Amino acid sequence: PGLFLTLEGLDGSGKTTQARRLAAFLEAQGRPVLLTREPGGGLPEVRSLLLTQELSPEAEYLLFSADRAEHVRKVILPGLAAGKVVISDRYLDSSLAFQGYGRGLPLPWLREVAREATRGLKPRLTFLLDLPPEAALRGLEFFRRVREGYLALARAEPGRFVVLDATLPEEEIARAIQAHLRPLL
Amino acid sequence: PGLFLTLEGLDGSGKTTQARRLAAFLEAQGRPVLLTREPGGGLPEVRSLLLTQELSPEAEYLLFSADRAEHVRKVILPGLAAGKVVISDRYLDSSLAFQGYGRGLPLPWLREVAREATRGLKPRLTFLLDLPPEGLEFFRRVREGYLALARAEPGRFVVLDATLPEEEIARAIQAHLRPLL
Ligand SMILES: [Mg+2]
Ligand SMILES: [Mg+2]
Ligand SMILES: [Mg+2]
Ligand SMILES: [Mg+2]
Ligand SMILES: [Mg+2]
Ligand SMILES: [Mg+2]
Ligand SMILES: [Mg+2]
Ligand SMILES: [Mg+2]
């Protein structure tokens, strides 16, 4: 038991919708599931703080890392230990795309920080809902750096990333996630 | 140039009292000074997050580091660039002693996190007010941890007996500084 999955992409890429549909799919199959998300699954106040405040990228990354540290320890690892499929809407790859490719932080430092923040926990599969910023349902150069950063991450770890066309019908996307998922159960 | 100084120790060691007196002493010597402190110097709200019940040592450190990162960029480096004496009541060594020696986090990771957080900025001198720790086992660890950090960097740390009268401590800080004036 225990299966750790994540969803990634730009805000408005369909992640919550696809996390919900994946939950329901797994509920329909009798498989215990836990939905969670970042930011805020570890330290809710990190999410609400950063709604109205803009910090250096380093400080932003470090707040998200503290939230992720609590999130992994109090939510994700306990859920996995109970044998659940734990699905996180955003995880480490979010910081790497947004604070790294987006705001310019060096990836090897981000990962060194993450190593103890996440206790080395990595998803078995990560679904990237890929689209241009203009297609997001909810400046443009920044968001394009993020989109490309995600695609770069996916190219480096083709054993973990599944890249999906986020502009396809939500049902069609969900059925694609289910086919990629079927061999792992 | 600008001069970066820190004060360290357990809570109740007098390090805040000495930070305040040093600032006034330099400020009455005409030298422009910036008095600041951690936690709160970079992200004043960090104080709320740090009080979270059952916070993991990793998360606690990462919170202090977030404040520290903002502190260095927005307050300390600009102060130093203006040629001020910048005095910080607590800096990185507080995390090394409390979250490393106290809560058990590995020092090399703490330092690697710190290297971008702080942008490598080290105090020229750090005044450690050494107070006997009287849970107690945790404060013994922290107290001894601080002494170990001082032993490792004997040019940077000035270890002072925190039970001496306050004005004697102030005079001993002043004497260590006079060669940088
Ligand atoms: Mg991920
Ligand atoms: Mg992290
Ligand atoms: Mg730090
Ligand atoms: Mg210090
Ligand atoms: Mg500090
Ligand atoms: Mg190191
Ligand atoms: Mg001590
Ligand atoms: Mg040292």
Side-chain angles (χ1 to χ4, degrees), chain B residues 76-93:
Chain B
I76 299 165
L77 286 172
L80 292 172
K84 303 189 174 179
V85 183
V86 174
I87 301 166
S88 189
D89 181 352
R90 295 201 172 286
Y91 186 61
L92 174 59
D93 301 291

Side-chain angles (χ1 to χ4, degrees), chain B residues 137-154:
Chain B
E137 31 283 289
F138 167 85
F139 291 111
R140 290 192 271 256
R141 284 200 298 286
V142 180
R143 190 271 173 118
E144 289 188 11
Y146 266 138
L147 296 180
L149 295 167
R151 287 199 306 283
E153 283 175 82

Side-chain angles (χ1 to χ4, degrees), chain A residues 43 45-46 49 53 55-56 58-59 62-63 65-66 69-70 73-74 106 109 112-117, chain B residues 43 45 48-49 52 54-56 58-59 62-63 65-66 69-70 73-74 106 109 112-113 115-117 119:
Chain A
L43 296 178
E45 199 167 358
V46 163
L49 188 288
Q53 204 166 148
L55 307 177
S56 64
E58 290 88 353
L62 297 154
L63 290 176
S65 304
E70 289 293 280
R73 284 159 186 78
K74 299 185 163 43
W109 179 75
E112 181 58 26
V113 175
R115 194 178 49 81
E116 295 281 1
Chain B
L43 263 152
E45 302 85 342
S48 196
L49 289 150
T52 301
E54 321 214 321
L55 200 65
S56 67
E58 288 83 0
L62 288 163
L63 292 174
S65 295
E70 209 71 358
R73 284 160 184 76
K74 300 304 224 306
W109 184 75
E112 196 101 84
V113 171
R115 188 179 36 73
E116 295 286 339
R119 302 182 68 74

Side-chain angles (χ1 to χ4, degrees), chain B residues 4-8 88-94 123 125-127 146 156-157:
Chain B
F4 182 32
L5 310 168
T6 67
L7 294 94
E8 290 297 344
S88 189
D89 181 352
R90 295 201 172 286
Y91 186 61
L92 174 59
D93 301 291
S94 285
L125 286 178
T126 296
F127 301 104
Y146 266 138
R156 182 164 71 90
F157 286 79

